[PDB]
């Protein structure tokens, strides 16, 4: 399953460097776009993001495992697009930053797995029609 593995590698790498603050083919191009658009979405939606973060009340590892419920519940609500997919990964980065401050850095890798799982399981067909990560790069090109 190339699509699950590829998506996990991109989401995990970006979530790691958003918490650490230290950066590290098709995947190479996708991370460049994700840094540019992701950090953009985080600024434009800080009021909504901090409001959701305080409502969730993430203090330990148990809370991180229960996030998959809310994830599926709100991500599946309406119609999907590249922007909503970017908001999913951007808020995922906004939570990973909170996990660094509360000394729960060990919960960054499983959160990235849970995010990839929801994305691929609910939207595989949409992602395939849209040309996967090649499509993601071409969509946000400026």
């Amino acid at each position, epitope marked *: 399953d190339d699509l699950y593995r590829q998506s996990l590698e991109i989401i995990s790498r970006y979530l790691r460097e958003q918490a650490t603050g230290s950066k590290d*083919a098709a995947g190479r191009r996708a991370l460049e776009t994700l840094r540019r658009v992701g950090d953009g979405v985080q600024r434009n939606h800080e009021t909504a993001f901090q409001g959701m973060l305080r409502k969730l009340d993430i203090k330990n590892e148990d809370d991180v495992k229960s996030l998959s419920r809310v994830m599926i519940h709100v991500f599946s609500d309406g119609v999907t697009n590249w922007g909503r997919i970017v908001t999913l990964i951007s808020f995922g980065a906004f939570v990973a930053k909170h996990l660094k401050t509360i000394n729960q850095e060990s919960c960054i890798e499983p959160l990235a797995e849970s995010i990839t799982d929801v994305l691929v399981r609910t939207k595989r067909d949409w992602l395939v029609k849209q*040309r*996967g*990560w*090649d499509g993601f*790069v*071409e*969509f946000f*090109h400026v």
Partner: single-chain antibody
Amino acid sequence: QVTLKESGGGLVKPGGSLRLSCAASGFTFSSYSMNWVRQAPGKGLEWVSSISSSSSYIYYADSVKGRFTISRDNAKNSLYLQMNSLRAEDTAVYYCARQVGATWAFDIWGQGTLVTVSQSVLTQPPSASGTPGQRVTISCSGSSSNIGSNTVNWYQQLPGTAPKLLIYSNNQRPSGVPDRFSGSKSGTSASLAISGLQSEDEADYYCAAWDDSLNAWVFGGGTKLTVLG
């Protein structure tokens, strides 16, 4: 100066082989999907193949599967068409075209190259006519898997010229297209409107959309528009 320029066309015997090249200038080539589109002499547009930016997503029309091979070299800004087992039916002018990531419209087209070897899924009326100032409408009929699931694009083709993007995303006009031109979509049909005819409007008009069942681009058969009196 954002341009595309085709090379390789020539006379070939049936069953022969020929290789096409397309050189891109003025843009980040590594960040765009690329297409081949052919036009038999005195006939309509026909999509051939497409390749994504990283070469991961490749598609072909049924009439070329197994004989034609699309490839790209981002380090040389080049797109290729490797054509084996060439048939009389393959005689056409082959166009190189750039596709927009956010819309799938073909915004930049090359001048074409003649390859000489020696029924469309979207229906349009074969002709339309009017007088200066008149409002004329051109229709485009498809089905659930194409127009019913995807956006419609329109292309203008002036006599002895390459096609150009007229309308994208059903009703959006690119920069340089007069507001006389407008579009609409309803169910599995679409329409092109010219509110106030001008003599430079005399041309051929084609619609196009992606098909989810065929995994292919389907073009309309075209409409020859004449400006009278």
